[PDB]
Amino acid sequence: RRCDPIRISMCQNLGYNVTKMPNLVGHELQTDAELQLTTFTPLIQYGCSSQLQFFLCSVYVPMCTEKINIPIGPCGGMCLSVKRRCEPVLKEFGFAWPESLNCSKFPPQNDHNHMCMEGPGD
């Protein structure tokens, strides 16, 4: 009775099946999260980072599990990884890496002390 299903299409079938609002960015409705996610569609299309779509979803519709009171988002390392490949593309369009995805506000790595989803180092 703790987790809701994922109603945002572009964030389905990525490795987890349910989430919980509010997300890591403040939205109280998945519908608001979906809307803002759309602003990233071009970047995703460009093949900037194979992890981009997953990273964004993990922030906008974080993994929820019935077994603990907090949501599970990305680790700081995935953020940096995506950022280093993706930020430069944003700058080419006159945009900044958003403050809402500041990599330093994510746990630095997945351990018992703090659950976060890592991705491949390469």
Binding site: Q45, Y46, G47, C48, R85, C86, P88, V89, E92
Partner: protein, 101 residues
């Protein structure tokens, strides 16, 4: 048309590294042509005579290629002093073109 398999322009990014100096790798948004041309390719035999020098075959084949492009520059960030500059063609449009023009 609107066929997604048509000859058209696609956008992609790539990481660029200078092989001769130690520099920060650089992301760059690029464009390529890719697709299927509507024209069937083909090839027929030609007949030679003593006074008629001809190739074995007459062929036609259409390839998806850049129609218009534009030079574009890539300033690298390197050993603390220097900036190296790569260049390449940024494709603006694609068209289907005869294989051997």
């Amino acid at each position: 048309d609107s066929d997604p398999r048509r000859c058209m322009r696609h956008h992609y990014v790539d990481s660029i590294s200078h092989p001769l100096y130690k520099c920060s790798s650089k992301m760059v948004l690029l464009a390529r042509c890719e697709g299927h041309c509507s024209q069937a390719s083909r090839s027929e035999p030609l007949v030679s005579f003593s006074t008629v020098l001809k190739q074995p075959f007459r062929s036609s084949c259409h390839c998806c290629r850049p129609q218009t492009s534009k030079l574009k520059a890539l300033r690298l960030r390197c050993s603390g002093g220097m900036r190296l500059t790569a260049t390449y063609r940024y494709i603006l449009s694609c068209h289907c073109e005869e294989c051997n023009s």
